[PDB]
Amino acid sequence: MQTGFNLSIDTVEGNPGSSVVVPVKLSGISKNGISTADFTVTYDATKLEYISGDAGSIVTNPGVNFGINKESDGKLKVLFLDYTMSTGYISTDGVFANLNFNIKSSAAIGSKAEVSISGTPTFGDSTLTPVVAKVTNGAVNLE
């Protein structure tokens, strides 16, 4: 049956010349929780300039367990590990990462800047068994 476990990127409104946060969420986390994750987020670098990414509220011991890096303009790598591999699986549905972008002044109103998962994201539960996520991609709608 189709999984209830979801990885979703919000669709948000943004204004050219301004900045915006794009939340990335997990929901339907199963009872075994999430002990590992790694995935790629692509964004439209012709319109958005990545500032930084912050661990979301659901992330355990985020200072240690969470990482995010801009590999190249338009491509982010996201990483989570329970460094204890015992007591720090994610069990709570909600925001997993907040992605902060400046929006170029050249970006046109009425257009969109896609923010998406690239490829198939990897998640491991507390048993280090892979769990498949249902992905919903997002965007910054420029107005």
């Binding site: 590992t36 790694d38 590999e71 591999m85 990897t122 280090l128 892979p130």
Partner: protein
């Protein structure tokens, strides 16, 4: 061999650092010639955060060997 992603004969903190950097896009590949052999610690032929977790368990002393 598995776990020794820099191919230097030891499995330690630096292999963990390399794996983290690889998964964050700060390495294109590993110094070991055979990346999959060195980095794939559960035998699924992929190098990903499950392998990172397994390496962490080994360095914490929670496991003794990799289940190739």
């Amino acid at each position: 061999k598995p776990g020794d992603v820099d191919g230097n004969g030891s499995i330690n903190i630096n292999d963990f650092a390399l794996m983290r950097n690889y998964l964050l896009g700060n390495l294109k590949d590993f110094p070991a010639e055979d990346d999959i052999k060195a980095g794939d610690l559960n035998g699924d032929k992929s190098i990903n955060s499950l392998d990172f977790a397994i390496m962490r368990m080994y360095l914490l002393g929670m496991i003794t060997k990799f289940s190739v």
